[PDB]
Design a protein around this nucleic acid. Structure first.
Ligand SMILES: [Zn+2]
Ligand SMILES: [Zn+2]
Ligand SMILES: [Zn+2]
Ligand SMILES: [Zn+2]
Lengths: 195, 193, 196, 190
DNA sequence: AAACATGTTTTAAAACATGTTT
DNA sequence: AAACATGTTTTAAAACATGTTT
């Protein structure tokens, strides 16, 4: 299984979330001290990238899901069959109906499965912020609930976003848990009460 | 052309269907069948004069709400592809309704309408029995995402001539769920308005 | 492969049967003919009646071998649970291997045997014709574990396979019956009977 | 010698044991009902600190005189089974085990053949009034080949580094499958 | 024999988790 | 949001099966 350890690296690589409009019906929200994303299915979810020094030539940003619990860590993470086949969300998408993670607003995006591992992940060419901007924003879409039967089956997962050299050398990586449910607002308020 | 009829039609042979926290339960006041997935469901047929020759009994599911009637009712992709319940089995894996205990049961998909149903040759009751019994199995829960997506359905059991002329028809709503007992009681209190 | 359990009267019309089952409510054993099943308390002696219609050959023998009833289990040898196999109780000064489920009492020629390849255990007795004026040759069997013995039969039904054989193990006849070794043969039998 | 004593002896340090489902304890019957292998928390209390290498020993013994002389051990089934015996520092025969303490040491008396398990005594955590010991019982009371439904008593003893007894408390233990049911049973029985 | 004892299974009820409707 | 809907899990109670005690 692939690494899931925070490694800031040569470019002080960092992922973070802009304000989580606590406005009850927020499409997604983020608990900082839980290191957890609460996102509704398919809704676009902006992620912030910051680097302390410019990265290599044609560096890239990969996003890969993986289960949290040790017992499942071995098993790939993809969309449950119901979702993989159903008409919704698939319409005319440049992404394979199996991949749980999609990037929005980037035709340079490119999805991928590893012949060997057969693990699914989406890559995007790193691109520095615009003038007077501190972050590079990447738009993500998560295509199944963390409760789809025939998929995550209510089995927690976490996203492993990593920065890499055009040829796969790991320049940095960060990780957060992701529960994609119907009420991120409520499921977060509650999670913050279990303690 | 139009969506299959759902009006009761006793017909010339006075065709009627009836039912005897168990595997299922039937509310007569709501004409609705509550039952667990894949479990066996006994349905009682009754006629008052023997039906014709190759007379058959066909069961076909169809959505209850007008908003959905035009969509064929089938199993969700999950269940249709799963190994579970489809191992040794002659029912095409997509068919919602199956019949167990009858080797003559034949599944059919309309070449034009694409509708799926399962027929059984009609046979009179056993000697001293008043009912011909048919054993039905329902292969998806009503809530199956990718399938019925909790849209209510009606079962349309129809007595037909060897060549598909309808001789009788009875209907009832079917709610395939995990706790027929609970859910039925729910609907019952719901009207306790 | 798993040994055969089909009745085979054979050339000598070999048959097995049981005398009165004395019901008594507290009988040490009882046999249901309609279920071909023997109900009997552990260790208590169990008389079985053999009958032939023509004398068997020379060193002809009678072998009794237990085997699981259900296909799911047929391949597992039937032996005593570890508790009983190690206990002093019953193994006191016995000539019989402490692991063997079936024993025969009252016969010094009885010989226990474990198949070197199959590992199956059985007990043989040299065949002897009935006493003068008697129609049956009687064999006294003892069953050393209750059916429910954890670590052993674990409530898996068994069948007893009594077989008439040639001095060199060629089978001449075979009869079978289910055996339920329990604490209240009376109760349990009545149970199975009401059950149907 | 004679069979180990079972009389309560608070001793100089006012040694006492008590209890805070997987188990339940009846105070009126001084009897512990609990499932096999499931963890059982027991609360020790002293009023003055025990000596140096002071230890807490737990030893099972039959309750009825008819049986007191027989060592209490695991039935052959459980003693040989792989189940509960895989990676274990406890000898597979010992009825009583302690979980969560690497210093726990099992012992068999060379002469009496009795088995028990000791744990070095340690004062409660700061702001806690009880030292807690986690006990596991590895056979049901009914185990054929073992306890064969003969009731037992647990004898938890506070001892000096060299086995001089400083305090002793006792309680009956019934290891079964439904502590709840069985306890209610004994309660109605009276 | 009848009543009990006691581990297992079956059934029933609540409680959860989480998506939808009002 | 608040209430509901609905499959899963947890807990509780009965019912079994079967050996022991009275
Ligand atoms: Zn899905
Ligand atoms: Zn389905
Ligand atoms: Zn045994
Ligand atoms: Zn044991």
């Amino acid at each position: 299984s692939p690494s899931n350890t925070d490694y800031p690296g040569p470019h002080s690589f960092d992922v973070s979330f802009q304000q989580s409009s606590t406005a009850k019906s927020a499409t997604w929200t983020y608990s900082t001290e839980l290191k957890k994303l609460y996102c509704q299915i398919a809704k676009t979810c902006p992620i912030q990238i910051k680097v302390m020094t410019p990265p290599p030539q044609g560096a890239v940003i990969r996003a890969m899901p993986v289960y949290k619990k040790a017992e499942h860590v071995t098993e790939v993470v993809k969309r449950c069959p119901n979702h993989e086949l159903s008409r919704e969300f698939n319409e005319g998408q440049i992404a394979p109906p199996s991949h749980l993670i999609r990037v929005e607003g980037n035709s340079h995006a490119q999805y991928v499965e590893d012949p060997i591992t057969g693990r699914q992940s989406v890559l995007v060419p790193y691109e520095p912020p615009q003038v007077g901007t501190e972050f590079t924003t990447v738009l993500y879409n998560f295509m199944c609930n963390s409760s789809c039967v025939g998929g995550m089956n209510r089995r927690p997962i976490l996203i492993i976003v990593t920065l890499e050299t055009r040829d796969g050398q790991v320049l940095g990586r960060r990780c957060f848990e992701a529960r994609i449910c119907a009420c991120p607002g409520r499921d977060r308020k509650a999670d913050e009460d279990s303690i």
